[PDB]
Amino acid sequence: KNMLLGGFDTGNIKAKISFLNEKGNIESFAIPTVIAEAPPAKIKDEDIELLHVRIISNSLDGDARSRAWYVGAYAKDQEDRQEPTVDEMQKNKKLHLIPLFTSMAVAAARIGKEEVSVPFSGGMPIGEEQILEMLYGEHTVEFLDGTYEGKKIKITINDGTMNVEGVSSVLAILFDIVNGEIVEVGESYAINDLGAGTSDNAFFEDGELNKKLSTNTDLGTNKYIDEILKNIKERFMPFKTREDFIQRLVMPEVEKMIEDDTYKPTFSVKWGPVKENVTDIVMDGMLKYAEDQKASLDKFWDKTNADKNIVVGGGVLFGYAGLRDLKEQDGFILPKNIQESAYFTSRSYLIANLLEQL
Ligand SMILES: Nc1ncnc2c1ncn2[C@@H]1O[C@H](COP(=O)(O)OP(=O)(O)NP(=O)(O)O)[C@@H](O)[C@H]1O
Ligand SMILES: [Mg+2]
């Protein structure tokens, strides 16, 4: 007892976490990979809307040693916010450690523990031992504002794993944890995690990650979303972030499609004294993404000649209108519980971790 069990999926867009709550079920949320220096004191995923935390950890250095930060959403608005630098083609570790520890704390607060040991179960994209040791030790997160203002969580990380080999990265395709731990309603396979800014094409052969053909591209949903937004704003002549566009406009419709294959989606936008039907605009970007992904998956299938191709990630949902065709194709596997496709990897890392504890 007094332990937090989770799977951790980090990137340049979000830090994703899937953990076990008090009633033994999987709970998931994502903290945007954004931070900003904050004053020593105050001025459905409610608790991460406003994150102002003091973080004391030895994995942090210099001025970041034990000061305060705006983390995630509440950081994206700040002037001097920090985000992953990326050129026209570490010592930025706080940019990844801080949203990481912050997620561990939020989950800890959610389940009413104030001291938690967190066996680390995560992943790296194309050493393992060295990266883990920027995580070991004791980390304290105090909330200075928001839902858990005044709370102080002690995170202890003694043991970890990056789930490099074997079926660990995949486990969420076959299993689910409902008070633990139950089956969902080949020997050569690809895993395609379809994300916001990137697309991860990994290939597993004979129990081992094929560390030469396992690639990684920037085929993300974001560029397609930006296109759609540009075409909507022009239709008028609305949304604050992309996640706002996805959550408010896209998610409710993608969902009725899931539970009814006959349902036609409608996308309308209210901006000012005008309301427009932009169903045609949205669906265009969706199928464009779908076909571009269909093409990308095809050639990676041919390049690896995998026996089966698993497609996961939120891109399965954003491009669902087109990507649901992969259900009818032998050689492709979509998650049965497809509404959890976005957190497939973190959910997989969580399942790998629960097994590690046994
Ligand atoms: N239910 C949904 N319906 C439609 N789009 C969704 C849904 N869930 C997630 N998305 C979108 O799918 C895209 C991919 O999400 P996700 O895989 O979680 O990105 P990410 O992993 O955080 N970024 P990356 O590091 O590149 O993988 C994003 O644009 C999400 O907003
Ligand atoms: Mg991802």
Tab-separated table of all heavy atoms in Angstrom, residues 261 294 320 322-334:
chain	number	residue	atom	x	y	z
A	261	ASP	N	-22.257	2.819	-36.954
A	261	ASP	CA	-21.538	2.911	-38.219
A	261	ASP	C	-22.349	3.611	-39.308
A	261	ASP	O	-21.821	3.930	-40.373
A	261	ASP	CB	-21.129	1.516	-38.695
A	261	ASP	CG	-20.383	0.735	-37.632
A	261	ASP	OD1	-19.832	1.365	-36.705
A	261	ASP	OD2	-20.349	-0.510	-37.721
A	294	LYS	N	-2.986	5.813	-44.235
A	294	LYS	CA	-3.172	4.553	-44.958
A	294	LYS	C	-1.971	4.245	-45.844
A	294	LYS	O	-1.515	3.106	-45.919
A	294	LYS	CB	-4.435	4.596	-45.825
A	294	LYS	CG	-5.745	4.331	-45.102
A	294	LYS	CD	-6.871	4.161	-46.114
A	294	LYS	CE	-8.239	4.324	-45.474
A	294	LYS	NZ	-8.386	3.493	-44.251
A	320	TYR	N	-10.739	8.644	-37.663
A	320	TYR	CA	-11.605	7.468	-37.561
A	320	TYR	C	-12.512	7.278	-38.766
A	320	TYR	O	-12.743	6.148	-39.193
A	320	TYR	CB	-12.465	7.542	-36.297
A	320	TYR	CG	-13.371	6.342	-36.118
A	320	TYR	CD1	-12.869	5.134	-35.647
A	320	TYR	CD2	-14.724	6.411	-36.432
A	320	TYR	CE1	-13.689	4.031	-35.487
A	320	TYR	CE2	-15.551	5.312	-36.274
A	320	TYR	CZ	-15.027	4.125	-35.801
A	320	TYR	OH	-15.843	3.029	-35.641
A	322	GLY	N	-12.003	7.591	-41.731
A	322	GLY	CA	-11.309	6.856	-42.771
A	322	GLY	C	-10.564	5.632	-42.267
A	322	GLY	O	-10.484	4.620	-42.963
A	323	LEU	N	-10.024	5.718	-41.056
A	323	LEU	CA	-9.173	4.655	-40.520
A	323	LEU	C	-9.952	3.445	-40.003
A	323	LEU	O	-9.364	2.399	-39.733
A	323	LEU	CB	-8.280	5.200	-39.404
A	323	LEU	CG	-7.140	6.120	-39.846
A	323	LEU	CD1	-6.283	6.521	-38.658
A	323	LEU	CD2	-6.298	5.445	-40.918
A	324	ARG	N	-11.268	3.582	-39.870
A	324	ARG	CA	-12.098	2.464	-39.430
A	324	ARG	C	-12.200	1.397	-40.520
A	324	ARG	O	-12.702	0.297	-40.281
A	324	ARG	CB	-13.490	2.949	-39.035
A	324	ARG	CG	-14.278	3.558	-40.179
A	324	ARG	CD	-15.631	4.044	-39.705
A	324	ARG	NE	-16.277	4.887	-40.703
A	324	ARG	CZ	-17.479	5.433	-40.550
A	324	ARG	NH1	-18.169	5.219	-39.437
A	324	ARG	NH2	-17.991	6.188	-41.511
A	325	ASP	N	-11.725	1.731	-41.716
A	325	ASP	CA	-11.650	0.770	-42.810
A	325	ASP	C	-10.632	-0.325	-42.508
A	325	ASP	O	-10.710	-1.423	-43.059
A	325	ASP	CB	-11.286	1.467	-44.122
A	325	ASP	CG	-12.417	2.308	-44.671
A	325	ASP	OD1	-13.577	2.093	-44.256
A	325	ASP	OD2	-12.147	3.180	-45.524
A	326	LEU	N	-9.679	-0.020	-41.634
A	326	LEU	CA	-8.629	-0.971	-41.284
A	326	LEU	C	-9.185	-2.147	-40.487
A	326	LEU	O	-8.536	-3.187	-40.362
A	326	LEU	CB	-7.516	-0.275	-40.496
A	326	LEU	CG	-6.656	0.685	-41.323
A	326	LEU	CD1	-5.410	1.109	-40.559
A	326	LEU	CD2	-6.284	0.047	-42.651
A	327	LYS	N	-10.390	-1.975	-39.954
A	327	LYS	CA	-11.077	-3.049	-39.251
A	327	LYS	C	-11.432	-4.181	-40.213
A	327	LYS	O	-11.385	-5.357	-39.849
A	327	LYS	CB	-12.334	-2.513	-38.562
A	327	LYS	CG	-12.034	-1.528	-37.440
A	327	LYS	CD	-13.202	-0.591	-37.168
A	327	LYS	CE	-14.399	-1.324	-36.588
A	327	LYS	NZ	-15.403	-0.366	-36.046
A	328	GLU	N	-11.764	-3.819	-41.449
A	328	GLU	CA	-12.176	-4.799	-42.448
A	328	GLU	C	-10.983	-5.454	-43.147
A	328	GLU	O	-11.151	-6.413	-43.900
A	328	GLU	CB	-13.092	-4.149	-43.489
A	328	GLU	CG	-14.009	-3.058	-42.944
A	328	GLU	CD	-14.945	-3.542	-41.849
A	328	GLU	OE1	-15.194	-4.760	-41.763
A	328	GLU	OE2	-15.431	-2.696	-41.069
A	329	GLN	N	-9.784	-4.935	-42.901
A	329	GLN	CA	-8.581	-5.492	-43.510
A	329	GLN	C	-7.871	-6.479	-42.595
A	329	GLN	O	-7.559	-6.165	-41.446
A	329	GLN	CB	-7.597	-4.387	-43.897
A	329	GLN	CG	-8.120	-3.360	-44.878
A	329	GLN	CD	-6.996	-2.605	-45.561
A	329	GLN	OE1	-6.045	-3.207	-46.063
A	329	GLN	NE2	-7.090	-1.282	-45.573
A	330	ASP	N	-7.611	-7.674	-43.114
A	330	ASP	CA	-6.715	-8.603	-42.445
A	330	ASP	C	-5.308	-8.023	-42.539
A	330	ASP	O	-4.936	-7.457	-43.567
A	330	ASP	CB	-6.788	-9.993	-43.082
A	330	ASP	CG	-6.369	-11.098	-42.129
A	330	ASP	OD1	-7.200	-11.512	-41.292
A	330	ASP	OD2	-5.210	-11.558	-42.219
A	331	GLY	N	-4.534	-8.144	-41.467
A	331	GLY	CA	-3.199	-7.577	-41.438
A	331	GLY	C	-3.124	-6.313	-40.603
A	331	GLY	O	-2.046	-5.898	-40.179
A	332	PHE	N	-4.277	-5.692	-40.371
A	332	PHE	CA	-4.352	-4.522	-39.504
A	332	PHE	C	-5.203	-4.810	-38.274
A	332	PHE	O	-6.241	-5.468	-38.365
A	332	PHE	CB	-4.915	-3.315	-40.259
A	332	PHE	CG	-3.976	-2.749	-41.285
A	332	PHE	CD1	-4.008	-3.197	-42.595
A	332	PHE	CD2	-3.064	-1.763	-40.940
A	332	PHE	CE1	-3.146	-2.675	-43.544
A	332	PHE	CE2	-2.200	-1.237	-41.884
A	332	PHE	CZ	-2.240	-1.694	-43.187
A	333	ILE	N	-4.755	-4.317	-37.123
A	333	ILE	CA	-5.495	-4.483	-35.876
A	333	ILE	C	-5.706	-3.147	-35.173
A	333	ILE	O	-4.747	-2.467	-34.813
A	333	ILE	CB	-4.776	-5.442	-34.907
A	333	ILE	CG1	-4.654	-6.838	-35.520
A	333	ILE	CG2	-5.513	-5.510	-33.577
A	333	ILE	CD1	-3.924	-7.825	-34.641
A	334	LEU	N	-6.968	-2.774	-34.990
A	334	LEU	CA	-7.315	-1.609	-34.187
A	334	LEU	C	-7.754	-2.078	-32.808
A	334	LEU	O	-8.287	-3.179	-32.673
A	334	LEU	CB	-8.425	-0.792	-34.853
A	334	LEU	CG	-8.125	-0.164	-36.213
A	334	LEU	CD1	-9.243	0.783	-36.619
A	334	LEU	CD2	-6.792	0.559	-36.185
